[PDB]
Amino acid sequence: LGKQYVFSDGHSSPGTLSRLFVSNYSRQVEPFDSGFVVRIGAAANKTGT
Ligand SMILES: *[C@@H]1O[C@H](CO)[C@@H](O[C@@H]2O[C@H](CO)[C@@H](O)[C@H](O)[C@H]2NC(C)=O)[C@H](O)[C@H]1NC(C)=O
């Protein structure tokens, strides 16, 4: 199954830009054992939240 990472838009208002909105990915450290592969853009051209 691997691991899922999701990015989001920052806080926005009509005519205004506000603080960013992210998860706690920066403080997580993963072991690099033999490398990894990344699947990118699998859910393209679809309605998403
Ligand atoms: C990053 O955030 C995730 C999601 O909240 C944290 O995972 C939770 O950690 C708490 C505290 O130990 C546990 O009680 C929950 O069961 C965890 N949830 C899941 C889904 O794993 C995670 O610890 C955070 N990483 C940090 C702070 O380094």
Side-chain angles (χ1 to χ4, degrees), residues 9-12 14-15 17-26:
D9 277 334
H11 288 270
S12 180
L17 293 179
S18 181
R19 56 210 296 255
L20 305 174
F21 196 65
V22 292
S23 181
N24 62 330
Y25 296 150
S26 301

Side-chain angles (χ1 to χ4, degrees), residues 3-12 14-15 17-46:
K3 189 168 185 304
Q4 174 184 317
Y5 299 86
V6 49
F7 292 158
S8 67
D9 277 334
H11 288 270
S12 180
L17 293 179
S18 181
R19 56 210 296 255
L20 305 174
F21 196 65
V22 292
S23 181
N24 62 330
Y25 296 150
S26 301
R27 60 190 66 188
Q28 303 180 52
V29 175
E30 310 291 325
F32 186 96
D33 300 313
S34 300
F36 53 88
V37 293
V38 184
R39 183 204 301 268
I40 305 180
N45 304 328
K46 294 162 63 172

